[PDB]
Structure 1
Amino acid sequence: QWALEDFEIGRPLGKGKFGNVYLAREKQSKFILALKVLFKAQLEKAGVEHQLRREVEIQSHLRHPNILRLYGYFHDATRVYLILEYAPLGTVYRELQKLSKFDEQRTATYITELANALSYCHSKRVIHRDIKPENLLLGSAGELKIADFGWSGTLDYLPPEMIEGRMHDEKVDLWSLGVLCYEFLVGKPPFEANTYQETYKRISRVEFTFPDFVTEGARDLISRLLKHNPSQRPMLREVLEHPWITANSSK
């Protein structure tokens, strides 16, 4: 049983459509964490946000070093509160804008962290279909943390099966992994274009190319992951064992 009076509120970390996220601290022990405040009146209008409740139930039973922890939640008369693990280094997206693009060691280490996390999720019957840089946070040691932002995803990261209105499964996560590996190395997504229509067309036809600096091992992995036919994509164990991943990962 938590209470608002148990925390000291600090600076705003980000803004959303149903409330904000603040840096906070437990008064007594002085423990740093993140607090998200949502307004009921807002939830019960944008839809029947019982979705929040299901998502909170699901997220609170996941324990992995590469998945952001939901420590708990409570509510009062007008607000609902989520107590979250704090990520000191911020978003991967912000880090990407600063460096322009990552080198092979950093990229390979990140892909390894995500495959492990996605593997644990699949065994828990949890499939994302979403995992943008903006939604990837960094811990104290620089480790990746997967957060739950789309609990309520532009075209760039969507797989062919989806925009083509077919049925999907856990194979969408392999596609996402390919788009991300590419964006990390090149600096931008593989199907980006001036119009929505052209992007839709390139994804469906799987039309993309690599800049000259991209390595052959990197091209190999990404070409295997971005397969039109979902069943032609490798298992997560095959990604963790790919020669390019093994050679450049710092472990």
Structure 2
Amino acid sequence: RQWALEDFEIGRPLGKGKFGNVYLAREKQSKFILALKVLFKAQLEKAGVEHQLRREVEIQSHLRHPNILRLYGYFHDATRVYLILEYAPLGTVYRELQKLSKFDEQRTATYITELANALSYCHSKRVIHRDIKPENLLLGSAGELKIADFGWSVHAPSSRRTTLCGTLDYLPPEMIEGRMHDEKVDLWSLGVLCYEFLVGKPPFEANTYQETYKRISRVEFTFPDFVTEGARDLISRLLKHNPSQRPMLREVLEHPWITANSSKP
């Protein structure tokens, strides 16, 4: 349907974004709580990012899965764009990791399972996220992971996939090396994530983006001794230089470390 500001009661602010603010809000008809993200056109246009917003809306509106943040719809006015989003009451995984500094194996495995299901659902529609990282993960009321921020996502048949995008510590080697990419870039970024969850910092971290690029390109990283055998195996399978050697998400879901540590529904 159509939407306008008049269809929502607005509550307190939930956070400060780069180009706006997110508010708690409630749809009058249904009385359904949700979040309403407000973006200022002036700030979007200044930063150059409207194309990312188009992409986010056009893709994410179509995605309906328990572990993907719903984008119910959008609308806009002379000054603002509004995104109507599912409310994630437990906040970002980024903030959870800041608090706890590292996650244990159960929490980690359970989140990797949720994220893999969601990316399975994306990849069947031939959609690739391309920006998996802790800031783009939110948490439902039962603590269940929700991937969001489809700004840098792409539908594979509709793109050439030769430009680099994403976030420094999470970028796959293929993009750094200038090659055509596919759904396997999500697989790489999943492995970086699993590592960062377990260790509390990403594997290719360095003082400049140059060193970080070199280190990714050469898959130069080591694990601390605390990381178990099974986690090490899973991550090492995800962080292969050669995209075609990375597992399918099915195989990630069936990995024995994942099986042994993931919580039951």
**What is the distance in 2 between the residues matched to 1:48 and 1:246?**
40
Are the aligned partners of 2:14 and 2:23 in contact in 1 as well (CA < 8 Å)?
yes
CA offset at residue 82 of structure 1? Answer: 1.3
**Structure 1, residues 184-219: CA drift from partner, whole Å, max 9, x if none?**
111110011223222122111111111111111111
CA offset at residue 52 of structure 1? Answer: 2.9
**What is the distance in 1 between the residues matched to 2:104 and 2:222?**
19
CA offset at residue 27 of structure 1? Answer: 4.0
**What is the distance in 2 between the residues matched to 1:199 and 1:97?**
22
What residue ranges of structure 2 are gaps of 5+ in the alignment? Answer: 153-165
**What is the distance in 1 between the residues matched to 2:102 and 2:203?**
14
**Structure 1, residues 123-153: CA drift from partner, whole Å, max 9, x if none?**
11110111110110000111100111635x4
CA offset at residue 32 of structure 1? Answer: 1.4
**What is the distance in 2 between the residues matched to 1:105 and 1:73?**
36
Aligned match for 1:240, one of 236, 248, 253: 253
In 2 relative to 1, CA 105–48 (structure 1 residues): closer, same or farther, beyond 3 Å?
A: closer
**What is the distance in 2 between the residues matched to 1:110 and 1:161?**
25
TM-score normalised by structure 1 residue count: 0.92
CA offset at residue 9 of structure 1? Answer: 2.0
In 2 relative to 1, CA 48–118 (structure 1 residues): closer, same or farther, beyond 3 Å?
A: closer
TM-score normalised by structure 2 residue count: 0.88
Are the aligned partners of 2:16 and 2:22 in contact in 1 as well (CA < 8 Å)?
yes
**What is the distance in 2 between the residues matched to 1:55 and 1:28?**
26
The residue matched to 1:21 in structure 2 has which SS? strand
In 2 relative to 1, CA 133–224 (structure 1 residues): closer, same or farther, beyond 3 Å?
A: same
Moved more, 7-16 or 55-64: 7-16
Moved more, 14-23 or 108-117: 14-23
**What is the distance in 2 between the residues matched to 1:100 and 1:112?**
21
**What is the distance in 1 between the residues matched to 2:141 and 2:10?**
21
CA offset at residue 20 of structure 1? Answer: 1.9
Are the aligned partners of 2:130 and 2:185 in contact in 1 as well (CA < 8 Å)?
yes
**Structure 1, residues 64-87: CA drift from partner, whole Å, max 9, x if none?**
000011112222333222111100
Aligned match for 2:193, one of 174, 177, 180: 180
In 2 relative to 1, CA 182–192 (structure 1 residues): closer, same or farther, beyond 3 Å?
A: same
The residue matched to 2:127 in structure 1 has which SS? coil
In 2 relative to 1, CA 39–234 (structure 1 residues): closer, same or farther, beyond 3 Å?
A: same
Identity %: 100
Aligned match for 1:195, one of 208, 222, 241: 208
**What is the distance in 2 between the residues matched to 1:55 and 1:100?**
30
What residue ranges of structure 1 are gaps of 5+ in the alignment? Answer: none
CA offset at residue 232 of structure 1? Answer: 1.0
